[PDB]
Ligand binder design. Structure first.
Ligand SMILES: *[C@@H]1O[C@H](CO)[C@@H](O)[C@H](O)[C@H]1NC(C)=O
Lengths: 65, 49
């Protein structure tokens, strides 16, 4: 059934997903890179994208590609 | 249209309110005041009193 809905190598796109007291939180960052086979050694902090009141529980996930 | 009022049509809307462990997706609108700078005041910004 239908529900809530919303609308908003060369690079590294880094993300964090977490679910707390009925809210789903997404954080991200983008950077240039000069390494292919691993995460590049250094530091930068992921900024919040969205904070969504969805109430849903999660135990599994998968990527779309 | 010639019917007496007990027989005439009425439209009805029943507004039902639900509250659970899941967060509030609906709220009544919250009004805001004008802004006073350079004076001592009570304040509230986004619920920060
Ligand atoms: C999420 O799981 C808890 C039990 O851990 C349950 O009480 C709650 O109703 C569930 N929420 C939904 C939207 O199914």
């Amino acid at each position: 059934n239908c529900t809530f809905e919303y609308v908003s190598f060369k690079n590294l796109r880094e993300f964090v997903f977490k679910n707390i007291d009925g809210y789903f939180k997404i954080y991200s960052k983008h950077t240039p890179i000069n390494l292919v086979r691993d995460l590049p050694q250094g530091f930068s902090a992921l900024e919040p994208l969205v904070d969504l009141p969805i109430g849903i529980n999660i135990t599994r996930f998968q990527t779309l590609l | 249209p010639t019917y007496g009022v007990g027989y005439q049509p009425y439209r009805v809307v029943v507004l039902s309110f639900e509250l659970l462990h899941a967060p509030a997706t609906v709220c009544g609108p919250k009004k805001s005041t004008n802004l006073v700078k350079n004076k001592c005041v009570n304040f509230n910004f986004n619920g920060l009193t």
